């Protein structure tokens, strides 16, 4: 045969066809009704879940103990009635209902900051629309959800949509022409409205505006019945991508989701804990199992001051809801740990949570752990930091040479040769305590402390093979290093 110049022995290719849709049913007048086909619109395909489920199952439960705080922790996750988001719900629902009722196409753009709750309210709107359609008030439709961060290649959207509307399996380009023909030329008497939910839109338009332009433009055609809802972080993202005139031609609806306040967040937290708060529980003393209404009758309380202070702190900085929920959950977890530790329980009066637990859980996310890290470092590393600070206090250049640091360390050692500690540390620092080792040039354990400081994210060193003129710089500002040095004793004194 032939001699290959290189080989690819780990190539895997999926079985997908190439011929687009506008070659199948011949003339346009020969297209049958697509509503009644058993493969179109997912009419009969409801067995994909059973293909891979029942694999992660096992048969054993050794009477898992459920402490009192377990219920509170379980009922406070980010998965388990919208209290604040009502205007956006009304606007989106009205737009979508008007679009569905009159058999038209439309585009809704939602922009916001993380944790506001845009996906939740969009899904709630979709559920309400599905219920209304099942009530036989508007023509039935299909709901397709497409995410942006859950795809390997960015151009995998097209085929997915096609695979959710036809049952075929084509490549991305052929899917693009198939979708174009389907949305343009198929008559409106043989289709069904589709509600796409393009999500994390900013992750698709990163090399070109092709996907966004196509998806937004497919709503312009008269024969199409598409209703696109796209959510994103930045508000004026399409303008920065497509252009003013194209956007003006398209004419979509725009909605902005502002952050939360310290009242709405507290309302959310209080709503998520209604039945549990101020209730009664039967608790077994031997094990610790708790049952909602020998054994004891106890109560669970959560101080409103703790909720208020947590909401006030969280809403001040970001406006999230996930972080507030997680803070409350962590406070409950700390209280549960203390309770089990005190009562000597294990895995398999009025118990409350005070403001102290919430404050302790809140301080863990704001404080930094650099000062504590340096107040426990070795003597040589602290000497290195001290020499660097001294050189910076003279040159004021923020980027020092390494040989200068070595010379400064040597001068500092040789000029204070009258203090007891540095008098008796010199031999262990230069000859490691033995009389058979010649006097070293740099220090004992130079590279070790250098790499220990450089790995932790405290120093920055440029790459040069000459190890005497390499430049290093700090990365934690200067006041923190000054505090860390001042907390010492032998370095403070000299």
């Amino acid at each position: 045969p032939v001699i290959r110049k290189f080989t690819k022995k780990n190539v895997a290719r999926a079985k997908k066809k190439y011929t687009p849709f506008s070659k199948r049913f011949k003339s346009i007048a020969a297209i049958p009704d697509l509503t009644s086909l058993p493969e179109f619109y997912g009419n009969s395909s409801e067995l994909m879940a059973s293909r891979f489920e029942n694999k992660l199952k096992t048969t054993q439960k050794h009477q898992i103990v459920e402490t009192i705080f377990s219920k509170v922790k379980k009922q406070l996750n980010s998965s388990y009635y919208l209290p604040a988001r009502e205007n956006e719900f009304a606007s989106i629902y009205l737009s979508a209902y008007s679009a569905i009722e009159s058999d038209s196409a439309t585009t809704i753009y939602v922009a916001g900051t993380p944790g506001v709750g845009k996906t939740l309210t969009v899904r709630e709107v979709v559920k309400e629309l599905l219920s209304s359609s099942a009530q036989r008030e508007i023509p039935d439709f299909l709901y397709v959800e497409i995410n942006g961060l859950k795809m390997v290649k960015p151009t995998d959207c097209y085929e997915t949509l096609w695979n959710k509307v036809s049952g075929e399996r084509l490549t991305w380009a052929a899917s693009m022409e198939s979708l174009e023909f389907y949305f343009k030329r198929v008559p409106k008497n043989k289709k069904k409205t589709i509600v796409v939910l393009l999500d994390e839109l900013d992750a698709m338009v990163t090399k070109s505006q092709d996907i966004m332009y196509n998806f937004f433009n497919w709503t312009t055609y008269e024969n199409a019945k598409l209703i696109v809802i796209a959510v994103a972080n930045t508000m004026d993202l399409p303008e920065r991508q497509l252009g003013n005139k194209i956007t003006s031609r398209i004419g979509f609806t725009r909605i902005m989701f502002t952050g939360y306040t310290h009242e709405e967040l507290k309302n959310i937290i209080d709503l998520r804990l209604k039945g549990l708060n101020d209730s009664f529980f039967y608790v077994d003393t031997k094990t610790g199992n708790a049952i909602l209404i020998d054994v004891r009758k106890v109560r669970l309380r959560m101080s409103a001051d703790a909720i208020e202070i947590a909401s006030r702190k969280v809403a001040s900085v970001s406006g999230d809801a996930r972080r507030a929920l997680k803070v409350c959950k962590r406070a409950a977890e700390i209280a549960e740990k203390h309770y089990m530790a005190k009562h000597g329980y294990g895995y398999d009066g009025v118990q409350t949570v005070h403001i102290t637990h919430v404050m302790k859980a809140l301080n863990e996310t704001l404080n930094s752990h650099v000062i504590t890290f340096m107040t426990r470092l070795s003597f040589t590393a602290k000497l290195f930091i001290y020499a660097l600070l001294n050189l910076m206090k003279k040159n004021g250049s923020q980027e020092q040479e390494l040989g200068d640091i070595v010379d400064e360390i040597k001068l500092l050692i040789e000029v204070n040769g009258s203090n007891k500690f540095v008098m008796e540390i010199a031999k262990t620092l230069f000859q490691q305590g033995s009389d058979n080792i010649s006097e070293q040039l740099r220090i004992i354990s130079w590279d070790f402390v250098l790499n220990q400081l450089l790995d932790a994210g405290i120093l920055f060193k440029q790459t040069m093979k000459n190890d005497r003129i390499c430049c290093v710089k700090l990365n934690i500002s200067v006041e923190e290093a000054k505090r860390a040095m001042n907390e010492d004793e032998t370095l403070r004194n000299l």
Binding site: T7, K9, N10, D447, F448, D455, K465, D467
Partner: protein
Amino acid sequence: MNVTTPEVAFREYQTNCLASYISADPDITPSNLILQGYSGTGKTYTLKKYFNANPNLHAVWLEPVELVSWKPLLQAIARTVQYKLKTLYPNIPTTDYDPLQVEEPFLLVKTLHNIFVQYESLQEKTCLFLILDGFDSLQDLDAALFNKYIKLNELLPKDSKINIKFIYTMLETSFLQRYSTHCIPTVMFPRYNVDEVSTILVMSRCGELMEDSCLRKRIIEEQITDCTDDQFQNVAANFIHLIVQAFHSYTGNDIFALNDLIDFKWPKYVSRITKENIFEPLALYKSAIKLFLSTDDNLQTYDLSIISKYLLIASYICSYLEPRYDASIFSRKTRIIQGRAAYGRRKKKEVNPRYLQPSLFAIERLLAIFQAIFPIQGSALREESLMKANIEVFQNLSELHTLKLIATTMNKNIDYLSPKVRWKVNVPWEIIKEISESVHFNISDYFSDIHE
């Protein structure tokens, strides 16, 4: 424990540490081990002797210098592991995995796990030693490859009957200090003294030297030599000692350079001997004093045309002289319009500018000076005595440039026709001096004035 320590000449502590670290029990042995030492320090010799002293230990030898990348290294590992495991146990049925399928570090782990699964019918856990002898000699090396081979020992199965352990042999210290935080056990091989080098050199190239045919021919052409073996060994040892004492200050503590000089200077020293001084080392030393002073480790200088010969000199003058003083050196004609020449330099430079990098000039100045210094061309109204720049001058200049004797501002696909291009010289003073002396030109007079 249960291992045997071999006897190496001047590597006692290294041998003790090696016997302390590696053994046949996977429970007590380190997953990684580094041996460090510069060129010609005696590490592969010690390791090979140690493995030859203990035949129970299994080992696979690689040399990541023939392999010049990481993908070939992975494939070589995946192939040699299979080959060694097949040749050792022949009664275990097994399939074959193509080494060329290994293209990524993860695929190497998958293939190694698949290979190690089959040999699960063995009695007790063993250990297989993989010696990457020369890890620092990879041609395209970066500071990330080692971080993968360090952690490769955690993704493999933990309860398999075949355990793999790595052993590296590293040259430099700057590379090794990069990974000093990992705290991997190390054994360092310091360089040799002079006495140790002399003794090692004698012990190595003493026996082999005497069975050479040259000395046999020289003694069959000569008379009898009683006490043949002892006298021959003494002669060899004396020659080795003489060559060491002569060229230690030039070869350093390098075994290879001395081992090459000994072979270089043997065929003549054996010719210089004779019967009347075969038993007199001193007189023999006097009779062969010539080959102990000059090392001689080397293998018109150029064959250029006349105009190229002067063109190189003109380029050198252009590059290593300052333009402001040009007019004072070459103006040699009368004037009709009133004018004055240049006064010239007032003080001499004290740096001898020929010790520094050459400067840049222009083509026009080069042509002008070439015309100025070119020898005169061999009813004078139509003489045209001065040489003019015709086609062949430019052709020879291009020939000079393409031979790397003239450089320019180096960038890909130069365009010779642009004002932003300048030239310079790439020959040392010796070559230009030889060229000048080969055409009867006194170049030194131009440079003696500034500094001899």
